[PDB]
């Protein structure tokens, strides 16, 4: 069994790796232990060549070397590695691994988001608010949790960007699950937005995972913005 955040972060990681036909992550407890996929991820999201590393790290010393290379790169970019060391990754500390991946999502997916001079999380929230301004009172984006669980904010974002793809006014606003599914399907099929979260992970969830939602909503910002150039 894997948590929403585990699954969402794994899917995010894989969208990056697949951009270079690299092998996927299936289990974050085990699949980062030799340091290779972490290094490759960093090259991809960081747009840099990290140079040579151990490509057959059969011995523990070489896995630690690989992971240490990754962590040093992350530190060199000014990201906090609060209370994580190479052995935490080699030995599959899932809590610390998810923490690290969030640090990377925040830096490489969210930090550069900008709306009205606000950046990062604030910027992304404000973008959502501005883009859904015409959908009050039923849509009211106030956070990256409860504001998203009825499906309508996702549908409104799609509709305002491409009113030909999703007829918002024809939705049965009470069918949260059908509307969520519709948005996720249209986003993926027509807008190229990867399905980082399952409908059941957010639809009518009392305490949805904030970081997972943020990770997925950031895909809307980047795709919409790029497509609107
Ligand atoms: Zn747009
Ligand atoms: Zn509650
Ligand atoms: Zn969270």
Author numbering: 6 to 234
Please, what does the article write about this entry?
Indeed, the overall fold of S. pombe α-actinin ABD is very similar to other actin-binding domains. Further, there is a π-cation interaction between two residues from G1 and G2. In the S. pombe protein this interaction occurs between the conserved Trp107 and Arg216. In addition, there is a salt bridge present between helix A1 in CH1 and the loop between E2 and G2 in CH2 in the S. pombe protein; a strong bidentate hydrogen bond interaction between Arg12 and Asp206 (hydrogen bond distances: 2.9 and 3.1 Å, respectively). Taken together, the strength of the π-cation bond between Trp107 and Arg216 and the interaction between Arg12 and Asp206 indicate strong interactions between CH1 and CH2 and may favor a closed conformation of the actin-binding domain.
This group of proteins is characterized by a highly conserved N-terminal actin-binding domain, a central rod domain consisting of spectrin-like repeats and a calmodulin-like domain at the C-terminal (Blanchard, Ohanian & Critchley, 1989; Otey & Carpen, 2004; Sjöblom, Salmazo & Djinovic-Carugo, 2008).
